Design an enzyme around this catalytic site. Structure first.
Site, PDB file in Angstrom:
ATOM      1  N   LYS C  86       0.663  -1.251   0.001  1.00 52.18           N
ATOM      2  CA  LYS C  86       0.050  -0.017  -0.042  1.00 52.18           C
ATOM      3  C   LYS C  86       0.791   1.151   0.062  1.00 52.18           C
ATOM      4  O   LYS C  86       0.406   2.149  -0.528  1.00 52.18           O
ATOM      5  CB  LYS C  86      -1.061  -0.108   1.093  1.00 52.18           C
ATOM      6  N   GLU C 108      -9.768   6.422   4.392  1.00 49.56           N
ATOM      7  CA  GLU C 108     -10.537   5.371   4.806  1.00 49.56           C
ATOM      8  C   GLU C 108      -9.992   4.221   4.882  1.00 49.56           C
ATOM      9  O   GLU C 108      -8.598   4.061   4.585  1.00 49.56           O
ATOM     10  CB  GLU C 108     -11.832   4.960   3.845  1.00 49.56           C
ATOM     11  N   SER C 376       2.116  -9.627  -0.925  1.00 51.18           N
ATOM     12  CA  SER C 376       1.703  -8.435  -0.949  1.00 51.18           C
ATOM     13  C   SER C 376       1.755  -7.729   0.550  1.00 51.18           C
ATOM     14  O   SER C 376       2.375  -6.323   0.699  1.00 51.18           O
ATOM     15  CB  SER C 376      -0.081  -8.215  -1.093  1.00 51.18           C
TER      16      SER C 376
HETATM   17  O1  LIG Z   1     -11.427  -0.837   0.024  1.00 49.66           O
HETATM   18  C1  LIG Z   1     -11.283   0.529   0.003  1.00 49.66           C
HETATM   19  N1  LIG Z   1     -10.160   1.192   0.785  1.00 49.66           N
HETATM   20  C2  LIG Z   1      -9.066   0.248   1.051  1.00 49.66           C
HETATM   21  C3  LIG Z   1      -8.857   0.392   2.657  1.00 49.66           C
HETATM   22  O2  LIG Z   1      -7.545  -0.288   3.210  1.00 49.66           O
HETATM   23  P1  LIG Z   1      -7.787  -1.239   4.375  1.00 49.66           P
HETATM   24  O3  LIG Z   1      -6.900  -0.435   5.431  1.00 49.66           O
HETATM   25  O4  LIG Z   1      -6.893  -2.365   3.896  1.00 49.66           O
HETATM   26  O5  LIG Z   1      -9.230  -1.610   4.753  1.00 49.66           O
HETATM   27  C4  LIG Z   1     -11.920   1.401  -0.752  1.00 49.66           C
HETATM   28  C5  LIG Z   1     -12.169   2.661  -0.641  1.00 49.66           C
HETATM   29  C6  LIG Z   1     -12.970   3.607  -0.987  1.00 49.66           C
HETATM   30  C7  LIG Z   1     -13.699   3.170  -2.318  1.00 49.66           C
HETATM   31  O6  LIG Z   1     -14.549   3.938  -2.899  1.00 49.66           O
HETATM   32  C8  LIG Z   1     -15.228   4.775  -2.408  1.00 49.66           C
HETATM   33  F1  LIG Z   1     -14.430   6.001  -1.995  1.00 49.66           F
HETATM   34  F2  LIG Z   1     -16.116   5.660  -2.925  1.00 49.66           F
HETATM   35  F3  LIG Z   1     -15.646   4.236  -1.233  1.00 49.66           F
HETATM   36  C9  LIG Z   1     -13.362   1.792  -2.475  1.00 49.66           C
HETATM   37  C10 LIG Z   1     -12.601   0.878  -1.920  1.00 49.66           C
HETATM   38  C1  LIG Z   2      -4.772  -4.002   1.527  1.00 54.13           C
HETATM   39  C2  LIG Z   2      -4.077  -5.425   1.444  1.00 54.13           C
HETATM   40  C3  LIG Z   2      -4.533  -6.252   0.591  1.00 54.13           C
HETATM   41  C4  LIG Z   2      -5.634  -6.040  -0.396  1.00 54.13           C
HETATM   42  O1  LIG Z   2      -6.041  -4.809  -0.817  1.00 54.13           O
HETATM   43  P1  LIG Z   2      -5.700  -4.831  -2.419  1.00 54.13           P
HETATM   44  O2  LIG Z   2      -6.249  -3.364  -2.839  1.00 54.13           O
HETATM   45  O3  LIG Z   2      -6.552  -5.915  -3.015  1.00 54.13           O
HETATM   46  O4  LIG Z   2      -4.357  -5.149  -2.805  1.00 54.13           O
HETATM   47  C5  LIG Z   2      -3.699  -7.343   0.304  1.00 54.13           C
HETATM   48  N1  LIG Z   2      -2.722  -7.593   0.952  1.00 54.13           N
HETATM   49  C6  LIG Z   2      -2.165  -6.592   1.922  1.00 54.13           C
HETATM   50  C7  LIG Z   2      -0.778  -6.910   2.491  1.00 54.13           C
HETATM   51  C8  LIG Z   2      -2.868  -5.568   2.012  1.00 54.13           C
HETATM   52  O5  LIG Z   2      -2.233  -4.620   3.101  1.00 54.13           O
END
Ligand SMILES: O=C(NCCOP(=O)(O)O)c1ccc(OC(F)(F)F)cc1
Ligand SMILES: *Cc1c(COP(=O)(O)O)cnc(C)c1O
Ligand SMILES: O=C(NCCOP(=O)(O)O)c1ccc(OC(F)(F)F)cc1
Ligand SMILES: *Cc1c(COP(=O)(O)O)cnc(C)c1O
Ligand code: NA
Ligand code: NA
Lengths: 252, 393, 393, 252
Positions: C86, C108, C376
Site C-alpha cells: 500500500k 478510509e 503483498s
Molecule cells: O477498499 C477500499 N479502501 C481500502 C482500505 O484499506 P484497508 O486498510 O486495507 O481496509 C475502498 C475505499 C473507497 C472506495 O470508494 C469509495 F471511496 F467510493 F468508497 C472503494 C474501496
Molecule cells: C490491503 C491489502 C491487501 C488487499 O488490498 P488490495 O487493494 O486488494 O491489494 C492485500 N494484501 C495486503 C498485505 C494488504 O495490506
C-alpha cells in the site's frame, strides 16, 4: 607446601587410590557446610575439591547449579568462603584442599591478590573452570608464585599438543575426564591423574585406580546427598559418612 | 594456537572450558577458509540480496533537521527481512554451519529477536534449530516465541540463575560443548569467545560498506559521524568497521542509560561497568563489587546483554570510538519524533542512536555536521510498550 | 467530459453526487499532467527508492517446490516500508495532493493498513491526515490505530451503518465533497470512481515492472502465471499491469473464500456477487437480492472490501485474467508452510495467493510451470490470529 | 402525467411558492409513515419527496442516515416502499410525488423495470443521488419512457456547461442547492427551480421564493420532528402539522 606430593607418596606406600569429594562451600549454609566438610574428612576423604558459589557457573550441570543457588539463598559470598577455608585448614593441617573457581572470581580484584589469599588460608590448588591452557599463563604463574598448584582438565579427546601442555603446566594433580591418556600423561611426567567424570559408586572408584589413575573425584554424588536430605540435617551427615566410607574403601 | 588474533588490545580471548576449545578452533578455521572462498562469498551475497533484501536504503531526514546545520541520514536496517540487522549475520553463520557439515543450530536469545533471526535462517537453509531462552523472557516475549515455533524452531525455557539472557547464554554453551560435532552455536552478538566477535563483525560489515557508498553517492563525502546503539555490539561494529580506517569519521556507540546512570539502573557496562571475564571473554561488564555477574536494564530489552563486544572496548581505549548513553526517556522521545516527522517506527534499541543524534543537533544547531544513524530495527514490536507509558502519563 | 476513459468495458464510471464531480475532474487533470511531468516521476521514483526501499526482492522458493516441476518466486512487497504494497501508491497520491496545492489528506481504512500507509505518507510529506474508520474496526484494530496516531494522524471512528469499511468509505466521501479545495481523498484500493482505479494502478505498476525485469534476469523468460490476492484489487493490478500485453502470461486473482463459497460467508464478489452501482462505480459486489450492500467475510480483514476494482471485472469478462477463491483454512495452511519452509511470515491476505500457487503445484506436480506470487505484505500482524486458531484445534 | 406542470401552473395562478417536505418511507414504521405523509399533505404540502431506505446513503447527513436506520429497524424494504407509494397515490390523486433514490436500488433488478414500477404506482419524478448528469443517460431515458421526470441537482458553483446539461436533461423541477443560478436556469428553459439546502424555518421559504425559485424543499427539519417525538406518535403528528402549516403559509 607439598600437601599433594606428600599425600600421593603416602597413598603409594599403601598401594591406595585417593578419594576426593567435591562440594560447594556454603551449601546449604555456612555452619552446615562446615559440618559436611568435617564429616567428609572424618569418613576418609583424602583431599577436598571445593567450589565457591558463582552467579553463572557455565561448566557445572544442574546438580551443582542448584548447590550454588542454595548457597546464594543463604547469602554466601567469596569473602565468607575464604573465612570457611581458613577454619577448615586450621582443623585439618595435611589434607590437600583444591578450589574450583570461575575466572571472574579470580580476576575480579586482581589475579595475584586472589592467589595470595589462597596461600594465606592454606589452599593447595585452584582449577579455573573457564581458563583453557591456551589462556592460562597469568593464572598458572600467579598460582606458582604463591605456592598454589594450578590444575588443568585433560579432556578425553585431548591431542598430543594438549597433553604436553597439561603435563608441563599442571601441578598437584591432573584432572582427568584403553587407558591411553593415563599412559601419555605419565610418559610426559604430568602430575598424578585423578579421574573426575562419572564417579558415583564404589565400583567406579576401583575401576579408575585399576586403569592407572591415582584416584577419583566425585562431586555430584556428594551434592545429591545434600540435596536429598535438606529437611534432615542429621540424616544428611550420616548419609554423607556412609557414602564416603564406601567410596574410600574401594580405593584400598 | 589460532589463525587470527583473539584479542583487541587487552580485551577478548577464549575463556571457555578446555572441552570447548576444539569447537572454537574448528569454527575459526572454517571461517578463515570461507573468507577466502569466492563461492562462499557469492552464496552469502545472493541470500543477502534476493532473500534478505540488501542493499538497504539510506534515508535523509530533512523534516527532523529543518532549520539546523545537521544533515541526518538513517541506514535502514529496519527494512531488512525480519525487521532488524540480526538477519545479516545469522545467514552467514548458517552458511558456515553448512560448510562445516553441521545440520543443527543452537542459539540463545533475550528479548527474542536473535531467536527469530536464527529460526528464519535455519528454516531457509534446512537446519534443525533449537533456541535457549530464559523462562522469564519466554513469559514476556510471547510474540517472538510464537514466531520462533511457527518457523519450526524448538524453544527451550531456561530456569537456571536469573533465567534471563545471560543464563540462556550458559545453557547454549553447555549444550554446544557436548553436541558441537553436529551442531553449530549461532551466537547472537559481536561478543563471546573468539572467533565470534570477529565473525559477527565481518558478517555485519556490509552495513558500513553500503553506508559509505550511499553517502558518497548522495553527499560527495564521508560522514562526520556514524552513530549506533550498543547492546552487545553487532549493529554498531557492522556500521563502524568500514570506517575505522577513515580517521575523520567519528564512531559513536550509544549504550542504554535506563533510568539514569546515577540510579545504577542502566545497561552501559563499557563506560560504567568493570572489566571482568565471562561469556568466554575479557570485557567490561555489569557485576557486583564481589564479581558476580549482574543484568543490564533498559526500556529496550534488546540492549540488555550485560557486557559488550571486546572490539568496542578496544576502540574506546585507543580513542578511535566514543561511547555515550541515552536514557529510557530520551529514547522514547526519539521514537515519537521519528514516527511523527518521518513516518518511520524505529525499534526502541535504534531509538537510542537516534536520540543521541538529536542531541548532537539540538545542542549545537549551527554546527555543520553530516550524521548517519544506524536504524538497526523497526519498532512495531514496541508500540504497546510506548503506548502504555504515554498513557500512564 | 474526461481526459481518460472512466470505463473498463461496462465496469467503472463516476457514480458520485454532482457536487463531487469537480473534485474528480480536478484530480484527473492533475494526474494526467503529473504522468507527463519528468520531475514528478523522478520525485516519486526517489521516494520509492530511498524511503520505501524499492526495488523489492524476488525470492525463489526451492524448499517449497522440491520434487515438483513448479518454480516459485515471491515478489517481496512484504519488505516494503510499512510492511505492505500500500505504501507505493500513498506516496504517489501524496505527491499528487501536493501538486494540487492540498495540505490535508482524507483516508478510509478497514483493517487499518491503508490508514497506517496514509498516515506515514502524510507524516513524511507534511500533510495533515485524517482517517475514517468504522467504530467496530477501531475497536478490533488497536495496533494500527496506535500507529496511525503515533504518526500524527487524526483517527475518526464512524458509527453509521454497519460501522465497518464501507461506512468509513461513505464518511470520507461526505467529508471530501465539502473540503476538496484544500483536502485530497487518498482512496485505498484500485476501485471507487474514476480516476481512482487508473491512478492506483499506475502508482502500483512498478510491482509488475520489477517482477518482469527480475524474472528475465533470473530465468531468461516471462512467468507462466503471476498470482495475487484480490481484496479491492490494488496489489493484483500492480502485479498484472505490465504483463497484460504479454498474452502468454497468466493473470490469476485470488478472492477470499472465507468459510467456503457455499456457506455464503466469503469475500468473492467478482465471481460470486452481482453487478451493482456503489462506491462511485459499477462493479460486482456483495449485496442482498434487494440491492442493499453487504459485507465481505475473510479470516483476513484486509480482503473485506465488499466489491472489486472495475478493471479486474473487465479483465475477467474478456478472459484475460482468471479469478479463483481460497478458503480461510487454505490460507492458514499456506501461512504455516511459508513460515516453516522459507522463514517468511506472510500476511494472511498474501497467503491466499500463496495458497492458490501451492494448489497449482500440488494438483499437477509434474506440470512445468514458472510462477510468481505477489507477497503483498508481511504477517507479523496475524501471528496472534493464527496462534489462537491453531491452539483452538 | 403532468402533475408537476399542473401544480406549478396552479401555484403561479395564485402567486404562490411550493412547499415540498422530504421524509423517509417507512420511518419510524410503515403505518406511522403513512400517517405522517397524510398529515404532511393535510397540512398543506404541495408535493412530496420520499426516500427509500438504502444501506449506504452516502449523500445524506446524519439526520437522514438515522431515518434510514429507523426504517431498517422496522424491516422496511424497497418492495414495501412501493406498496406504500401505491396507497399514497390512491388517497391523493394530484399531489406530485418524487423519489430520492440511490443508484443501486434503481439499477438492481433493471433500470427499465424500476421506472416501470414507478409509473405503475403513480410516482412523478426520481432523483438518483449518486448519478451525475455525465452518467445519467440510461436513467433519464428510462425515466422519460415511463412518464417519470428525472430530477437533477444543480450545485451552487455549477459552470455554464453543467447549467445547460441540467436545463436540457431535467424535467418536473430542478433541484437547486446574487440569484445568478435561478436566472441562468430560466434563461435555459430549465424545469422550475426548487431550493433544497437549509430550509428549516418559514423565513427561508419566503426568501427562496423571493429570489425567484418556484418553491422550497425541506427534509431534515421534517425528519428531526420525527426523531424528537418518537416516544409520542400523536404529538409527532400534531407537531408535523404545526410545522408544515407554518412553512406552507410562508409561500403565499
Ligand atoms: O477498499 C477500499 N479502501 C481500502 C482500505 O484499506 P484497508 O486498510 O486495507 O481496509 C475502498 C475505499 C473507497 C472506495 O470508494 C469509495 F471511496 F467510493 F468508497 C472503494 C474501496
Ligand atoms: C490491503 C491489502 C491487501 C488487499 O488490498 P488490495 O487493494 O486488494 O491489494 C492485500 N494484501 C495486503 C498485505 C494488504 O495490506
Ligand atoms: O547477547 C548475546 N546474544 C544476543 C541475543 O539476542 P537478543 O535476541 O537480542 O537477546 C550474547 C550471547 C552469547 C555470548 O557469549 C556466550 F555465548 F559465551 F554467552 C555473548 C553475548
Ligand atoms: C539485537 C538488537 C540490537 C542490539 O544488539 P547489537 O548486537 O548490539 O546490535 C539493536 N537493535 C536491534 C533492532 C536489535 O534487534
Ligand atoms: Na551491553
Ligand atoms: Na473484494
Amino acid at each position: 607446601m607439598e600437601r599433594y606430593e606428600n599425600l600421593f607418596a603416602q597413598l603409594n606406600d599403601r598401594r591406595e587410590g585417593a578419594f576426593v569429594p567435591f562440594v560447594t562451600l556454603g551449601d546449604p549454609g555456612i555452619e552446615q557446610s562446615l559440618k559436611i566438610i568435617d564429616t567428609l574428612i572424618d569418613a576418609g576423604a583424602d583431599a577436598l575439591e571445593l567450589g565457591v558459589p558463582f552467579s553463572d557457573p557455565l561448566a557445572d550441570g544442574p546438580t551443582i547449579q542448584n548447590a550454588n543457588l542454595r548457597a546464594f539463598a543463604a547469602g554466601v559470598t567469596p569473602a565468607q568462603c575464604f573465612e570457611m577455608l581458613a577454619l577448615i585448614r586450621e582443623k585439618h593441617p595435611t589434607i590437600p584442599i583444591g578450589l574450583l573457581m570461575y575466572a571472574n572470581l579470580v580476576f575480579n580484584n586482581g589475579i595475584d591478590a586472589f592467589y595470595a589469599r589462597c596461600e594465606q588460608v592454606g589452599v593447595d590448588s585452584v582449577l579455573v573452570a573457564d581458563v583453557p591452557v591456551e589462556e592460562s599463563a597469568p593464572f598458572r604463574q600467579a598460582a606458582l608464585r604463591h605456592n598454589i598448584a594450578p590444575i588443568f582438565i585433560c579432556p578425553p579427546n585431548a591431542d598430543d599438543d594438549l597433553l604436553r601442555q597439561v603435563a608441563s603446566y599442571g601441578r598437584g594433580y591432573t584432572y582427568l575426564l584403553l587407558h591411553h591418556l593415563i599412559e601419555k600423561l605419565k610418559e610426559y611426567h604430568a602430575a598424578p591423574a585423578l579421574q573426575g567424570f562419572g564417579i558415583s559408586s564404589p565400583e567406579q572408584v576401583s575401576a579408575a585406580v585399576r586403569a592407572g589413575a591415582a584416584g577419583a573425584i566425585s562431586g555430584s554424588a556428594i551434592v545429591k546427598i545434600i540435596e536429598k536430605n535438606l529437611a534432615s540435617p542429621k540424616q544428611m551427615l550420616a548419609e554423607l559418612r556412609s557414602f564416603v566410607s564406601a567410596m574410600k574403601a574401594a580405593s584400598r | 594456537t589460532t589463525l587470527l588474533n583473539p584479542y583487541f588490545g587487552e580485551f577478548g580471548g577464549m575463556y571457555v572450558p578446555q572441552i570447548l576449545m576444539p569447537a572454537l578452533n574448528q569454527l575459526e578455521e572454517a571461517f578463515v577458509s570461507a573468507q577466502k572462498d569466492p563461492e562462499f562469498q557469492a552464496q552469502f551475497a545472493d541470500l543477502l540480496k534476493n532473500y534478505a533484501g540488501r542493499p538497504t536504503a539510506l534515508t535523509k531526514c530533512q523534516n527532523i533537521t529543518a532549520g539546523t546545520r545537521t544533515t541526518l541520514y538513517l541506514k535502514r536496517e529496519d527494512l531488512l527481512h525480519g525487521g532488524a540487522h540480526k538477519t545479516n549475520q545469522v545467514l552467514g553463520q548458517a552458511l558456515l554451519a553448512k560448510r562445516m557439515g553441521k545440520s543443527e543450530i543452537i542459539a540463545e536469545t533475550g528479548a527474542g529477536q536473535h531467536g527469530v533471526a536464527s529460526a528464519l535462517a535455519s528454516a531457509l537453509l534446512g537446519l534443525k534449530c533449537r533456541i535457549y531462552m530464559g523462562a522469564k523472557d519466554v513469559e514476556r516475549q510471547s510474540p517472538n516465541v510464537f514466531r520462533m515455533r511457527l518457523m519450526g524452531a524448538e524453544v527451550i525455557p531456561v530456569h537456571s540463575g536469573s533465567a534471563t539472557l545471560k543464563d540462556a547464554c550458559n545453557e547454549a554453551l553447555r549444550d554446544w560443548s557436548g553436541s558441537y560435532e553436529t551442531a553449530h552455536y549461532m551466537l547472537g552478538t559481536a561478543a563471546g569467545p573468539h572467533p565470534y566477535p570477529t565473525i559477527v563483525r565481518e558478517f555485519q560489515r556490509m552495513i558500513g560498506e553500503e553506508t559509505k557508498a550511499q553517502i558518497l553517492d548522495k553527499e560527495g563525502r564521508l560522514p562526520d559521524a556514524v552513530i549506533a546503539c550498543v547492546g552487545g555490539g553487532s549493529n554498531a561494529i557492522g556500521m563502524f568497521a568500514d570506517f575505522i580506517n577513515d580517521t575523520s569519521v567519528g564512531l559513536i556507540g550509544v549504550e542504554p542509560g535506563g533510568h539514569g546512570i546515577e540510579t545504577g539502573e542502566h545497561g552501559a557496562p563499557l563506560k560504567h561497568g568493570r572489566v571482568g571475564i565471562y561469556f568466554g571473554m575479557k570485557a567490561p561488564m555489569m557485576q557486583t563489587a564481589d564479581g558476580q555477574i549482574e543484568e543490564s536494564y533498559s526500556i529496550s530489552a534488546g540492549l540488555d546483554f550485560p557486557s559488550v563486544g571486546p572490539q568496542h572496548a578496544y576502540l574506546n581505549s585507543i580513542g578511535r570510538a566514543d561511547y555515550v548513553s541515552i536514557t529510557d526517556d530520551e529514547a522514547l522521545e526519539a521514537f515519537k519524533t521519528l514516527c511523527r516527522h518521518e513516518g518511520i517506527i524505529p525499534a526502541l534499541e535504534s531509538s537510542h542512536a537516534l536520540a543521541h543524534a538529536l542531541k548532537m543537533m539540538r545542542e549545537q544547531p549551527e554546527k555543520e555536521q553530516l550524521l548517519v544513524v544506524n536504524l538497526s530495527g523497526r519498532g512495531d514490536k514496541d508500540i504497546f510498550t510506548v503506548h502504555d507509558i504515554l498513557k500512564a502519563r
